[PDB]
Design a protein around this ligand. Structure first.
Ligand SMILES: *[C@@H]1O[C@H](CO)[C@@H](O)[C@H](O)[C@H]1NC(C)=O
Lengths: 210, 12, 213, 211, 207, 212, 12, 12, 12, 12
């Protein structure tokens, strides 16, 4: 009992020290955020409005020096879980959504002693997509761009967890089969300006289940 | 261009 | 009246002692694992949408666990052996349906019952939309769907997820539902990944149903 | 006699709410009666593709706490006051067979009287489990929904009804559905494990399409 | 900067330095007025009609008065409706929670009078039979306090004519008449008056 | 270097703490505010002729400038700009006057602040508004309009303007069900005869037809 | 009546 | 007119 | 039964 | 696999 009580006290003490004792990235203190998608279902494709609905897990990873600790100082704790509200999280947004994104999972992240955070919100997204050709052999193709709302690539650099969307949990009895699904980092520059602007382009080719 | 992009438009 | 006044006092003191004099439980760890037991009371299959392969269920989900930090001696608190409290006042487990298509909708008050051994029982009533092909629902054989429940962030060495029984409670199932239940089970499943020692533990709810005639 | 009456009320509310630790709810030692009554306003929707019916009603909830009593003499002869429902304890009375979260239509304000009695009247839209088969016949359809506490037995919260007749005096005269009968009936159940009664109020509505 | 420093002080004074609502001893008059913008939907399968309007609410509290010479001749200010008490005026035959379409901000003048104008979408109980005919349909909805009698909140209108000067010219429904009328009843048990404002709209499908 | 990153983190925290914690009640006749509005129209998602409601997705560019948000970048490690939650600052009460449903927010609510006290805020929104789509299935198309303006401030308190009367169509969804013939964003001033103060709206006018 | 009226029913 | 305008009607 | 009833099931 | 499982993916 005493050793489980000290283990609780050691965790309670880590979180207190880390938290109640980070303004976001800047060009002087830039952050890399790595995204990966696990597509579970194309739930709806609406050819009256050109809106398609996806369900996915979005894995977000980043690393902050201010979240580092030595396990030796805190009972060899190497990792912990905490509410996402207790830490800074990135402003990663779908750019062509047509309704507010709906969150389907607990908003809880995992922090490791090296300052790495993994946060995986499960989401339902409606986005702009013309499903014409979905009933053909070649299917329909749509695309949605993800990026920060306010930060350039000098402030948040975005990267992907390979360019292949994870399809290992795709619902086997979906109304739609996936021909392909890619998640690709894209650098854009505007003629005016030197800064890079970084997008992640999620591109899904799909057709009606035959 | 820039002035359409929410990350950039504040420069315009 | 003054005995009723003191009973109230005693209960406020207990609650104060447990909640206001100890910052919350930070959740389980590998050194301090927690058993959480799950039970479904299925009330209704409300809707099956064959254009989108989504089925909607209404159920009560029973969640039971025990914390040493919530134990007390009734003798020290006017013989109180149990109390009710807002679920906000305490830690609750992150048990999630893994193939929902919409946010779950809460149909009941969020209140938990705590007993003096530190056991907590929390029973949210919920409406869930999840991924399900209702093909064949309109026939003798009916349709079969499944949805897994589990923690979002904790392995089986941190939350040991269990059921007391593999039979879903159908005793309150709505007798005039559009759909009759052919069977409903709730089965603990354990997985290992080759990278890692820890078990990953799901409860699989499997429902076989058909249109009532 | 105006800012003093206003001062007296402010002092009363401070004394009841602030000078006092939180009412932890009822217990076996300190049980509570809650009386319920329905004013049925409309059957708005009847869906036979999903067996859901939608009702709009006002739900009158009445109970009495010793800790809410005062002597009007101590407080400038104030005998009652109105206050936000969040300032006070309220009972956890729930429909047991709802299919969507209940929607609140009215301000969340209670009336408190000097004997400790509280009257709280949420107006609500409720979707519940109901097969409307026969709604287009002379005998109509019949639906039922039970209301009760979520966590309290009948030894902690006793429920009673304001008569067994639902109030139909405000029923929308041009509804798609006419009411044949509406009753609200206290029901009691006992389990082999335990002494306590478990008490529900069964709202039963018989209705048909209005010609 | 002159105004800024005085206004910051004024708000901190009025707010930080709680109004328990009206009573029989300190009663309040609330004045109501509707600016009807649109009849958006009329559902004859459920007998529900949906309106969009601006609801003008006016009242006066002594506790919100100030001397302009104490605050640099500031005679009015705007603030979050959440910083002040507001009346519990409610549509009595709504079928869905009212949806708010506007900022919730009030205007306060130095004499303590408040003006608050929430824009709202309201679904209420209405049989639209006859809407597709010359005579049109007629619907009615009552507004009043949820908990206060006429001895605590005296409810009135300044005119019985609904404001139609902003009604949507290309609505699916044209307005044949719209009135907003104070009605008073008494119950035999009791001396207090109970006061409603009845909104009556007669409308038909645009031609 | 890592030492330097601590300094920059500290300088940003001080700046925000100074601006927000160590220190705005909105504009007055005596302290008036210019607000610049602009629209980037993304999609006409739906046109409902049974109710005369049309649904737009757009980004709303709001621009204003406050003395109380100025700083001297040399005092804060050369920081010339920062981002913060729009909850952390005052924002204008600019409203669509003919919406039929509450506006839906499709993006984070984060503002960019520059050292001259300039603020830029760009909420993405879905709006349902009063609109008869009669003509949408013809070559002339339909025309609809929605006015924007402050809910409680006159033109003497909030001077509302635009930098152009062409709506930004450069991001308009190329495979929308509806094509855009034109879209303008025009400042309109009126006076009531009682009152000297101007009353200023921005009228967003959209001409559109079904894509063929 | 008084008893159906939310402003009055507290007196019943 | 002023009395229909939410920015003006406080004058009325 | 008790174990189905949210008011009682905590006793099971 | 572990990398698709939200309880395990933090390890990858
Ligand atoms: C518990 O109940 C017993 C039996 O009535 C009584 O004798 C005792 O005083 C109670 N204990 C406390 C601490 O009130």
């Amino acid at each position: 009992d005493d050793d489980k009580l000290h283990s609780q006290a050691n965790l309670m003490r880590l979180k207190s020290d880390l938290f109640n004792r980070y303004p976001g990235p800047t060009k002087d203190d830039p952050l890399t955020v790595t995204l990966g998608f696990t597509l579970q279902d194309i739930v709806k494709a609406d050819s009256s409005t050109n809106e398609v609905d996806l369900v996915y897990y979005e894995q977000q990873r980043w690393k902050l020096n201010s979240l580092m600790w030595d396990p030796n100082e805190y009972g060899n704790i190497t990792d912990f879980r905490t509410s996402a509200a207790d830490i800074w999280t990135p402003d990663i947004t779908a750019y062509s959504s047509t309704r507010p994104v709906q969150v389907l999972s607990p908003q809880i992240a995992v922090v490791t002693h090296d300052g790495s955070v993994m946060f995986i919100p499960a989401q339902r997204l409606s986005f702009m997509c013309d499903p014409t050709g979905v009933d053909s052999e070649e299917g329909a193709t749509c695309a949605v761009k993800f990026g920060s709302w306010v930060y350039s690539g000098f402030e948040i650099d975005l990267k992907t967890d390979t360019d292949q969307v994870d399809l290992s949990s795709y619902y086997a009895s979906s109304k739609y089969e996936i021909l392909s699904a890619t998640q690709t980092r894209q650098v854009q520059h505007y003629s005016c300006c030197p800064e890079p602007y970084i997008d992640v382009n999620l591109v899904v080719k799909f057709r009606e289940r035959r | 261009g820039c002035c359409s992009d929410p990350r950039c438009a504040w420069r315009c």
